[PDB]
């Protein structure tokens, strides 16, 4: 188990840690989250009581350092920082636990939800998408734009998701225009898997990260990337059988975890009807089809 | 964006643009098999690529052989149209390449766009208009060269004959579409109107009769009357 202490909580805020969240009152004595499971990435996020616009937060991995939260009143947000003094850190953590001012990462033991949502997400790949190499953790928020969006403005603060574009030279071999546009298999398997992602676990990790950013921050370009990466698989006639079975699990847990009231803006009608009913893979997402039908039959 | 009655006049500016109509690319007759099932038999077709400002028509004849052994032909026809339009663009000197291509059917957007990826500065555009270019095959000389073709072939025409020696491109296109509209709504009456008088002939290098200005006024009036007549009949109005 690891701990992320908080210097203070000066302003009323809803704090999230992975899929969990708590309400914290202005200058309430709150000094962190404990019992956080080592072994996966995590995200701690924030929504100030006074500005329901902008959700923001930090992706991190306890294995890569001792991380804590401090409110910055000039910039007006909770900031994650790294403590290099291993001793000073255990000392703050121990003293705060003794005084019982920390909330416990509330994992139900049966629950594999977070693992299922983050199976393929790696901190090293996140830091490539959110480039800020002076920190071991990565900041994301509601407004950040993606690289592809900027092509249609500040590069430092952008989400460098891998660019997918169905009407591009990269997606279409000259002479196989119709074949490659109806059957995206060569784009998925040669260009994207073998070429850029190297393997499906990185593709999956980026797909999953894009979903979580869409879900926790309502990041619109992240939702776009998630849907593109699903569509590319569903629109390929020829996919490794192991990718199909693992995609069905991945989507199942994403659809299951989604807040019911956000299904309108977070789920693209066209993609999902194509994946589930028209695409080559209509019959290959049994668990995702079943949960989508019983929980969101309106969208279809 | 899409082309409608507002931005009609853009057609006649000096930006090169082509209309593409694919309605006549994949043409079949439907008949009964010996066992009583239904089968299709393909006949020769054509892409109707038209510069509305100059009247130049690039009539790409589509030979039934193209369909030989292929499935989902109606979908394939769209991709073949785009391949041929792309090859026509590539075949033209740069200064003759269109700055826009307007497709008469929205289904042609994705195939053309994919085929034109090598020409990113050529805008592919749909239209809201209801253009009557499917009736090109009611023009006898166009129907004849298409049906006689034994091999893929490109035939060039000016669909305005010599009209532009005397009228503007706005006017020529309005005459063309009136004539085609009429031919679409009641071909037999439209053709009767054009050919009633045997002393007004079609030049060998033309498609339409050599009407004087005054005879064109009468013709256009008769075509309008035909169209309104057929409209009252369709809707009992």
Swiss-Prot record, chain A:
UniProt modification remark: Phosphorylated on serine and tyrosine residues.
Keywords annotated in UniProt: Cytoplasm, mRNA processing, mRNA splicing, Nucleus, Phosphoprotein
GO cellular component: cytoplasm; U5 snRNP
Main location: cytoplasm
UniProt-annotated location(s): Cytoplasm; Nucleus
Known function: Component of the U5 snRNP complex that is required for spliceosome assembly and for pre-mRNA splicing. Involved in splicing pre-mRNA of the A1 cistron and other genes that are important for cell growth.
Subunit structure: Heterodimer. Interacts with PRP8 (via RNase H homology domain and MPN domain), competing with BRR2 for the same binding site. Component of a U5 snRNP complex that contains at least the U5 snRNA, PRP8, SNU114, AAR2, SMB1, SMD1, SMD2, SMD3, SME1, SMX2 and SMX3, but is not a component of the U4/U6-U5 tri-snRNP complex.
PANTHER family linked to this entry: A1 CISTRON SPLICING FACTOR AAR2-RELATED, PROTEIN AAR2 HOMOLOG
Name this protein carries in UniProt: A1 cistron-splicing factor AAR2
Swiss-Prot record, chain B:
Region (RNase H homology domain): 7-237
Effect on the protein of changing residue 104 to A: Reduced growth at 30 degrees Celsius. Strongly reduced growth at 16 degrees Celsius
Compartments where found: Nucleus
Subunit structure of this chain's protein: Component of the U4/U6-U5 tri-snRNP complex composed of the U4, U6 and U5 snRNAs and at least PRP3, PRP4, PRP6, PRP8, PRP18, PRP31, PRP38, SNU13, SNU23, SNU66, SNU114, SPP381, SMB1, SMD1, SMD2, SMD3, SMX2, SMX3, LSM2, LSM3, LSM4, LSM5, LSM6, LSM7, LSM8, BRR2 and DIB1.
Note: Present with 468 molecules/cell in log phase SD medium.
Domain notes: The MPN (JAB/Mov34) domain has structural similarity with deubiquitinating enzymes, but lacks the residues that would bind the catalytic metal ion. Contains a region with structural similarity to reverse transcriptase, presenting the classical thumb, fingers and palm architecture, but lacks enzyme activity, since the essential metal-binding residues are not conserved.
Function statement: Functions as a scaffold that mediates the ordered assembly of spliceosomal proteins and snRNAs. Required for association of BRR2 with the spliceosomal U5 snRNP, and the subsequent assembly of the U4/U6-U5 tri-snRNP complex. Functions as a scaffold that positions spliceosomal U2, U5 and U6 snRNAs at splice sites on pre-mRNA substrates, so that splicing can occur. Interacts with both the 5' and the 3' splice site, as well as the branch region. Has a role in branch site-3' splice site selection. Associates with the branch site-3' splice 3'-exon region. Also has a role in cell cycle.
Protein name: Pre-mRNA-splicing factor 8
Organism: Saccharomyces cerevisiae (strain ATCC 204508 / S288c)
């Amino acid at each position: 188990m690891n701990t992320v202490p908080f210097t203070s909580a000066p302003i009323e805020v809803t704090i999230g840690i992975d899929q969990y969240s708590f309400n914290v009152k202005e200058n309430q004595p709150f000094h962190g989250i404990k019992d956080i499971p080592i072994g996966h990435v995590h995200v701690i996020h924030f929504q100030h009581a006074d500005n329901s616009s902008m959700r923001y937060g930090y992706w991190f991995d306890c294995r890569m350092g001792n991380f804590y939260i401090q409110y910055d009143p000039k910039d007006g947000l909770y900031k994650m920082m790294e403590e290099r003094d291993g001793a000073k850190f255990e000392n703050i953590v121990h003293n705060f636990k003794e005084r019982q001012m920390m909330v416990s990462y509330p994992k139900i033991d049966e629950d594999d939800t977070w693992y299922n949502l983050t199976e393929f997400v790696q901190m090293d790949k996140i830091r490539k998408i959110v480039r800020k190499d002076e920190n071991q953790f990565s900041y994301v928020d509601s407004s950040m734009t993606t690289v592809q969006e900027n092509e249609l403005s500040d590069p430092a603060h952008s989400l460098n998701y891998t660019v997918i574009n169905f009407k591009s030279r990269e997606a279409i071999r000259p002479g196989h225009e119709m074949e490659d546009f109806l059957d995206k298999s060569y784009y998925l398997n040669t260009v994207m898997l073998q070429g850029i992602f190297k393997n499906s676990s990185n593709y999956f990790g980026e797909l999953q990260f894009a979903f979580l950013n869409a879900m926790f921050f309502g990041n619109y370009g992240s939702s776009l990337q998630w849907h593109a990466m699903i569509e590319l698989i569903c629109s390929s006639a020829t996919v490794p059988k192991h990718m199909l079975d693992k995609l069905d699990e991945i989507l199942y847990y994403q659809i299951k975890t989604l807040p019911e009231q956000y299904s309108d803006i977070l789920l693209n009608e066209r993609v999902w009807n194509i994946c589930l009913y028209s695409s080559f893979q209509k019959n290959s997402l049994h668990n995702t089809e079943k949960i989508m039908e019983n929980k969101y039959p309106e969208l279809l | 964006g899409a082309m409608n009655s507002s931005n009609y006049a853009e057609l006649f500016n000096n930006d090169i643009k082509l209309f593409v109509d694919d309605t006549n690319v994949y043409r079949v007759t439907v008949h009964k098999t010996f066992e009583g099932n239904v089968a299709t038999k393909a006949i020769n077709g054509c892409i109707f690529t038209l510069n509305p400002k100059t009247g130049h028509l690039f009539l790409k004849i589509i030979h039934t052989s193209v369909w030989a052994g292929q499935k989902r032909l109606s979908q394939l026809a769209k991709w073949k149209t785009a391949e041929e339009v792309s090859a026509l663009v590539r075949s033209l000197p740069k200064e003759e390449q269109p700055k826009q291509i307007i497709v008469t059917r929205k289904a042609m957007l994705d195939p053309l766009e994919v085929h034109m990826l090598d020409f990113p500065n050529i805008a592919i555009r749909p239209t809201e208009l209801r253009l009557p270019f499917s009736a090109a095959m009611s023009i006898d000389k166009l129907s004849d060269v298409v049906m006689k073709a034994t091999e893929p072939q490109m035939v060039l025409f000016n669909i305005y004959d010599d009209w532009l020696d005397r009228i503007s491109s706005y006017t020529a296109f309005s005459r063309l579409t009136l004539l085609l509209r009429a031919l679409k709504t009641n071909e037999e009456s439209a053709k009767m109107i054009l050919l009633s008088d045997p002393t007004i002939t079609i030049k060998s290098y033309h498609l339409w009769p050599s009407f004087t200005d005054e005879q064109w006024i009468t013709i256009e009036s008769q075509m309008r009357d035909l169209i309104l007549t057929e409209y009252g009949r369709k809707y009992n109005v």
